[PDB]
């Protein structure tokens, strides 16, 4: 159970093809208008990770 | 060399203020951004160049 929770929390630190994993970094170095399509893939990757974990 | 060079002033806002506990004060030091409460713990065993510590 601890390993599953740690692996799930480690999924948040994953890059998922992006430059970084921190939300403040991606929302600060990138512009608030051109980063929507780039953050969409990260948000759906995290959502599908949640779906796989709950399954 | 107007608006081009290496050495110049750096009077912008930097995260170097009077830090204190009892509240998760925002920290943006050493290229790391996060949210957490600071706690005064004595640590003298650090190296001359060591600044942080990881888990």
């Amino acid at each position: 159970n601890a390993q599953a929770l740690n692996s799930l929390l480690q999924q948040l630190f994953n890059k998922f093809g992006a430059i970084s994993s921190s939300l403040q970094e991606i929302l600060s170095r990138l512009d608030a208008l051109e980063a929507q399509v780039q953050i969409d893939r990260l948000i759906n990757g995290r959502l599908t990770a949640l779906n796989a974990y709950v399954s | 060399g107007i608006n081009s060079g290496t050495t110049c002033s750096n009077d912008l806002l930097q995260p170097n203020t009077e830090v204190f506990t009892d509240v998760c004060v925002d920290y943006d030091l050493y290229g790391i951004t996060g949210q957490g409460i600071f706690k005064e713990v004595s640590a003298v065993y650090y190296n001359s160049w060591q600044n942080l510590l990881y888990d």
Side-chain angles (χ1 to χ4, degrees):
Chain A
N1 287 123
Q3 172 212 303
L5 295 195
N6 180 49
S7 71
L8 183 63
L9 188 153
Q10 273 184 0
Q11 200 89 353
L12 188 153
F13 293 125
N14 224 317
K15 301 179 78 69
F16 291 167
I19 175 64
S20 60
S21 178
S22 298
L23 274 296
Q24 173 54 210
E25 182 167 355
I26 193 66
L27 294 174
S28 60
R29 74 211 310 290
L30 271 73
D31 191 60
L33 270 299
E34 60 89 20
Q36 296 323 90
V37 67
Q38 197 271 335
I39 191 167
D40 193 28
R41 60 186 184 89
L42 169 66
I43 208 70
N44 59 58
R46 260 180 211 196
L47 281 173
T48 189
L50 294 174
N51 272 112
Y53 171 72
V54 300
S55 72
Chain B
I2 299 169
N3 64 7
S4 285
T6 76
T7 181
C8 58
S9 63
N10 283 107
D11 296 301
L12 310 178
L13 261 70
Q14 272 75 239
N16 204 348
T17 53
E18 199 170 4
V19 291
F20 54 95
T21 185
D22 300 354
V23 58
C24 56
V25 174
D26 55 329
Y27 57 92
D28 313 77
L29 294 184
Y30 305 140
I32 294 307
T33 300
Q35 304 284 256
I37 311 153
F38 302 138
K39 288 196 177 180
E40 183 39 71
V41 169
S42 179
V44 176
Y45 54 90
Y46 290 170
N47 222 336
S48 311
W49 54 264
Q50 155 184 11
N51 318 313
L52 307 100
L53 73 165
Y54 285 68
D55 204 74

